[PDB]
Amino acid sequence: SMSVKKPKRDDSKDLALCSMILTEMETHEDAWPFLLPVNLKLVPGYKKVIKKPMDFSTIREKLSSGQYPNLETFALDVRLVFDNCETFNEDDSDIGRAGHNMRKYFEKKWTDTFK
Numbered sequence: 001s002m003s004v005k006k007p008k009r010d011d012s013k014d015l016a017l018c019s020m021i022l023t024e025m026e027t028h029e030d031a032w033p034f035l036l037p038v039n040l041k042l043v044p045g046y047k048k049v050i051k052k053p054m055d056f057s058t059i060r061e062k063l064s065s066g067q068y069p070n071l072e073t074f075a076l077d078v079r080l081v082f083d084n085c086e087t088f089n090e091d092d093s094d095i096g097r098a099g100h101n102m103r104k105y106f107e108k109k110w111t112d113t114f115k
Contacts, residue, residue: 011070011071014071017071017113018063018068018071018074021109021110021113022059022060022063022078024105024109025056025078025106025109026056028102028105030097030098030101030102031098031102032098033085033095033098033099034056034085034098034099034102035055035056035057036055036056036057037053037055037057037058038050038053040053046088049087050084050087050088052084053084054077054080054081054084055081056081058077059074059078059081062077071114075110078106079106081099081102082099082100082102082103082106085098085099086099086100
């Protein structure tokens, strides 16, 4: 509260560390559904159904331009990528499986780097 603060958690490396995680996600072999924004002209249904599209390239640009205020807003956008993928894709599809794998991969790197 006013003039009463918990001890300061060192956040000075968070930008670098989120960038490293994102690089690892970009280079995973199952990243291909997620590298670029879904083409809203060419994928019927996507525009209406997926209210907040997100992809790794969009996260990379937000990251590089100071549009994440803190490491939690960065994790929210990564998870949005996977939540969108589960909304639109069957679990038993190449893309559906890619999304589960990537979410797993991310959540481990997240825990190991920050928790």
